[PDB]
Each structure stands twice: as structure tokens, then as C-alpha cells.
Design a protein around this ligand. Sequence first.
Ligand SMILES: *[C@@H]1O[C@H](CO[C@H]2O[C@H](C)[C@@H](O)[C@H](O)[C@H]2O)[C@@H](O[C@@H]2O[C@H](CO)[C@@H](O[C@@H]3O[C@H](CO)[C@@H](O)[C@H](O[C@@H]4O[C@H](CO)[C@@H](O)[C@H](O)[C@H]4O[C@@H]4O[C@H](CO)[C@@H](O[C@@H]5O[C@H](CO)[C@@H](O)[C@H](O)[C@H]5O)[C@H](O)[C@H]4O)[C@H]3O)[C@H](O)[C@H]2O)[C@H](O)[C@H]1O
Ligand SMILES: *[C@@H]1O[C@H](CO[C@H]2O[C@H](C)[C@@H](O)[C@H](O)[C@H]2O)[C@@H](O)[C@H](O)[C@H]1O
Ligand code: ZN
Lengths: 166, 163
Amino acid sequence: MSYNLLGFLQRSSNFQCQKLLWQLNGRLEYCLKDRMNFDIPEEIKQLQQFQKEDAALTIYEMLQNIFAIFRQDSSSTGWNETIVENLLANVYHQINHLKTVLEEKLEKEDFTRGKLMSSLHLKRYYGRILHYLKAKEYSHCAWTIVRVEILRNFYFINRLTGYLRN
Amino acid sequence: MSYNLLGFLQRSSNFQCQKLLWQLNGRCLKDRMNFDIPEEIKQLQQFQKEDAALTIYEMLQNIFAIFRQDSSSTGWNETIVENLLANVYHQINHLKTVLEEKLEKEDFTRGKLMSSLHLKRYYGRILHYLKAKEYSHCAWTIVRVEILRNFYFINRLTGYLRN
Ligand SMILES: *[C@@H]1O[C@H](CO[C@H]2O[C@H](C)[C@@H](O)[C@H](O)[C@H]2O)[C@@H](O[C@@H]2O[C@H](CO)[C@@H](O[C@@H]3O[C@H](CO)[C@@H](O)[C@H](O[C@@H]4O[C@H](CO)[C@@H](O)[C@H](O)[C@H]4O[C@@H]4O[C@H](CO)[C@@H](O[C@@H]5O[C@H](CO)[C@@H](O)[C@H](O)[C@H]5O)[C@H](O)[C@H]4O)[C@H]3O)[C@H](O)[C@H]2O)[C@H](O)[C@H]1O
Ligand SMILES: *[C@@H]1O[C@H](CO[C@H]2O[C@H](C)[C@@H](O)[C@H](O)[C@H]2O)[C@@H](O)[C@H](O)[C@H]1O
Ligand SMILES: [Zn+2]
């Protein structure tokens, strides 16, 4: 599969993922009190030079984590859990999809000195989100704040998707 | 190749560090001292991306050790110093990660030998001055200005951190 097909398949699932996220809530002003900056790594937003493999490996890791975030207990939200499952199934498919394509591309390359952009700061960034969730005892507001941050993640993954050009 | 992300991370670090250094204001015997900035540092030549990072790496390791010394007499906000050192530290690491990758592709040359020793001795004179001046507020002012000047060269070298 060319990078172009993967990139389109990504833009396409992101959009689907974002759509599902937008079918869970009804704005909560009260929750603005739990507002917290998680500081997505600066390179995810501003780095201008991404090689096809790096952007790909980066989105791969972001997805893996978004999956893990949403795998937590959202019961306190009252969200339609069906939609949550769709969101999860969708991301899971993108992850395994990306995995197979990277496996093919990377097979014969000089290592890849992989996630130079990814690993490092993404792991810590997501740790904050998780720690935040646990600290707030998975409250409905905590989920409202995270959901907004997750949507924000998707906004940047779309930016990253444009470096997947053939 | 990881030099683009490195240089990105380096510009980010250069900005924060300088911003912080400039911020510091406190509550003098001289106000200016010559520490004989190594020709190596004020040397206008084209540093290959690997040497630019080597020099930058050596410069930061030393700058770290300097701001690590006791500055309680300056009245400077320790929180800012804590941040500056944190930043410097985290960046010395990225540089290390990248330099390690082609650690074997570089050879022991006199340019490298003389650059490491001259830099070591320069920061050496700097550390010695703080010590002799018992880490006074007036020695620290002189040192901060020196380090800010160091960063002018760090900016220049960071421009070679690409491709
Ligand atoms: C939370 O969970 C759900 C939210 O997630 C999901 O639904 C969202 C709306 C959607 O955005 C998202 O993609 C999904 O994630 C939410 O909604 C319901 O959940 C499920 C969907 O998975 C649906 O429940 C039933 O599923 C079963 C499948 O085996 C079936 O029992 C049943 O099948 C039919 O399918 C349609 C479409 O889903 C339903 O409208 C009908 O109720 C049902 O049976 C028949 O279907 C047709 C309608 O298509 C009826 O008449 C036709 O209408 C046509 C109109 O153009 C005309 O040609 C003509 O008038 C006639 O042919 C027929 O009379 C009737 O027997 C599903 O009910 C469910 O549909 C979703 O509402 C939950 O509500 C939230 O709590
Ligand atoms: C000493 O330092 C901390 C400052 O921490 C920061 O906040 C200011 C507003 C920013 O410009 C700096 O970049 C950060 O270091 C203060 O909270 C404290 O009040 C001050 O005494
Ligand atoms: Zn880092």
C-alpha cells in the first residue's frame, strides 16, 4: 500500500473518530473548573519536517494511546457506551492497519531510528492525561476535559496525516 | 535524520534558556571580565552537523555545571534557575542520543582534541572565578553575561543542526 492510500485511510478514520466523539456530550460549563493544560509535545504541533515513516510511527503511537485512554471507565459520564465502542473499534482498526503497513515498509530499512519524534514525549504526555483521570476519580467532568483534549489530538493527527505523501 | 527534530528541539531549548537568563534580576567590583573565549567557539567556519552538536553538547554540559553552583547570594528566583537547569539537562540528553548514533563514524582529530580541551579550560576559568569570588552576587552577574554571550554562539551553531 502506498503512503497515499494510508494517508487517505487515516484522514478518513480520523474524521469518523472525531464524528463519534461529537455524539457523546451536551456542553458542561460546570466542568470548566477541572480545566487543565496537558501540553501536547510541541513537535506534534510545530515540527515542519516529518519523513513518511516518522509521521506514520508517530500517528501509530498516538492512536495506541488514545485507545488506552478511552479504554478507561467512562461510566460516570452516562455516555452512550455503544458510541464509545465504535470509537474504540475504529481506532483499533487504524492501529492494526498502520501496523501492517509499517511492517512492510520498514522490513528492509536501516533500522528506522524510529520514534525520535514519538516515544519520548508522547509517553509522558499521555501519562498526564491518565494521571489526571485517576486523580479526578474518573468523574463526568474529567471525561469532558479529556474528550476535548482527545479531539485536539485528532486535530493534530490530521496535520500529521499530510506527511504521508507517496 | 533526527537532526531535523534535534535542531527543532534545540531552537526550543535555546529560546527558553535565553528567555530565562534574561529574566533574572536581583536585589559591583567589576561587571566585565575576559575569560578568553576559545577561538573554537568564536571561530567562524562551517561546522558539519555532527561537530556543531558536539560543540553544543560540550558547551551545555559545562553551562549546566556552572548554574549548578550556589547562587543563593544573587537573590535570583530559584524557581527560574531550577527551570533553566532542567531545560539544559533535558537537551544535553537529546544531543547525547543523536551523537551516540554515529559515535563510531567520527575520528580522534586534533581539531576535536584541541576543541574539547580549550572548552574545558574556558569553563574552567569561569568556575574558578566563581569560587575565588566566593559565589558573590557580583561574580554571578559577570558569569550570567558570559553565558548569554555563549548562547549567541549556540544560536549560530544550532543553525547547522539540519538534514
Ligand atoms: C446508544 O447506542 C446507539 C448509538 O450508536 C449507534 O447509533 C447511532 C444513531 C449511529 O450514529 C451509530 O453509527 C451507532 O454507533 C443508539 O442507537 C441504536 O443502536 C443500534 C445501532 O447499532 C440500532 O438498534 C437495532 O439493531 C438491530 C440490528 O440487528 C435491529 O433490531 C434493529 O434493526 C433496524 O434497523 C434500523 C436502523 O438502525 C432501525 O431504525 C430500526 O429500528 C430497526 O428495524 C426496522 O428498520 C427499518 C428502518 O431502517 C423500518 O422501516 C423502514 O424505514 C425506511 C426509511 O428510509 C423505509 O424504506 C421504509 O419506511 C421501511 O423499510 C422497519 O419498520 C423496522 O422494523 C435496530 O433497531 C438502532 O437503530 C439505533 O437507534 C441507542 O439508541 C443509544 O442508546
Ligand atoms: C518566582 O518564580 C515563580 C515563577 O514561575 C514562572 O512564572 C512566571 C510568571 C513565568 O514568566 C516564568 O517563566 C516561570 O518561571 C513564580 O510563581 C513566583 O511568584 C516568583 O517569585
Ligand atoms: Zn525530550
